Amino acid sequence: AVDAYFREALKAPRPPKQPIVQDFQFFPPRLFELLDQEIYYFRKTVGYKVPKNTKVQREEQRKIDEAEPLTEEEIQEKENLLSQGFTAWTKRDFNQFIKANEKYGRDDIDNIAKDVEGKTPEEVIEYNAVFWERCTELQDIERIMGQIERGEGKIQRRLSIKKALDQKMSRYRAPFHQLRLQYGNNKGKNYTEIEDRFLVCMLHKLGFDKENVYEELRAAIRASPQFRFDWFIKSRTALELQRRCNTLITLIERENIELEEKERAE
Numbered sequence: 001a002v003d004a005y006f007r008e009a010l011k012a013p014r015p016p017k018q019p020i021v022q023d024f025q026f027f028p029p030r031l032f033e034l035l036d037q038e039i040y041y042f043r044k045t046v047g048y049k050v051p052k053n054t055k056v057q058r059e060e061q062r063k064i065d066e067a068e069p070l071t072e073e074e075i076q077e078k079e080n081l082l083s084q085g086f087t088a089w090t091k092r093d094f095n096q097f098i099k100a101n102e103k104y105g106r107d108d109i110d111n112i113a114k115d116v117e118g119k120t121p122e123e124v125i126e127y128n129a130v131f132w133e134r135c136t137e138l139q140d141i142e143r144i145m146g147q148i149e150r151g152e153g154k155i156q157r158r159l160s161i162k163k164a165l166d167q168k169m170s171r172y173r174a175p176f177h178q179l180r181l182q183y184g185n186n187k188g189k190n191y192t193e194i195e196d197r198f199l200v201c202m203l204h205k206l207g208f209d210k211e212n213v214y215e216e217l218r219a220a221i222r223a224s225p226q227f228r229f230d231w232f233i234k235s236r237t238a239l240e241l242q243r244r245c246n247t248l249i250t251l252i253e254r255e256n257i258e259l260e261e262k263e264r265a266e
């Protein structure tokens with residue numbers, strides 16, 4: 001019924017002064033009951049009939065025909081309730097809150113609370129609690145959840161990659177010289193273990209998540225004396241290096257799983 005308020009809002013005549021409230025502001029159901037009464041009464045006072053669209057025409061015309069002006073009590077109530085929502089939040093503020101959720105994940109409220117311009121940490125924390133409680137009221141909840149879940153998936157992938165790379169590197173005294181990969185059937189025909197060892201080790205050294213890391217890797221390969229005569233590896237694009245590194249990460253992850261399952265024996 002509130003769902004249906006926002007849809008029709010976002011023709012049939014409306015009162016000129018009608019307050020603009022938005023779903024993400026989390027006003028109470030009752031407010032909408034009163035605002036709806038004002039709208040139906042306004043229709044009553046002007047000509048308004050409701051067009052063809054028989055059974056469903058009668059029920060809508062009835063709401064107008066039976067409408068009454070708000071009592072003095074109701075007017076006061078409506079005025080109080082017009083501040084029982086997040087009046088300081090614009091749509092832009094809301095969108096920034098969602099962006100912060102996508103960037104940091106739901107749980108990291110310390111970082112979200114510092115990432116909504118013009119809002120105090122206290123204000124974001126207050127908002128956040130009501131949001132998660134009532135987010136099912138939001139017209140756009142599907143898209144919003146998909147956006148937040150996609151950011152949370154990326155944070156989890158990053159944490160998995162970091163863990164997997166750190167554990168692998170920790171098994172060698174001198175990984176740039178000693179690191180071996182378990183290839184199974186995905187080695188391919190192009191890259192060598194000498195090349196792959198440098199890719200993994202140097203990606204890890206530079207920071208696998210670092211902005212523009214695949215161009216820095218490309219420059220580091222070019223500079224390594226070990227590749228003076230290796231035209232192949234020096235001529236790979238940044239995109240090609242990222243693709244190969246993604247394969248190598250997956251092999252390390254598959255290897256880390258089998259090692260944790262051999263340990264499980266004991």
Ligand SMILES: OC[C@H]1O[C@H](O)[C@H](O)[C@@H](O)[C@@H]1O
Binds near residue numbers: 119121
């Ligand atoms: O205090 C200055 C204000 O600057 C910005 O608007 C911040 O977003 C807000 O957190 C802070 O309260």
Ligand SMILES: OC[C@@H]1C[C@H](O)[C@@H](O)[C@H](O)O1
Binds near residue numbers: 106
């Ligand atoms: O999975 C949704 C997330 C995961 C996490 O365990 C929980 O603390 C958070 O609020 O919900």
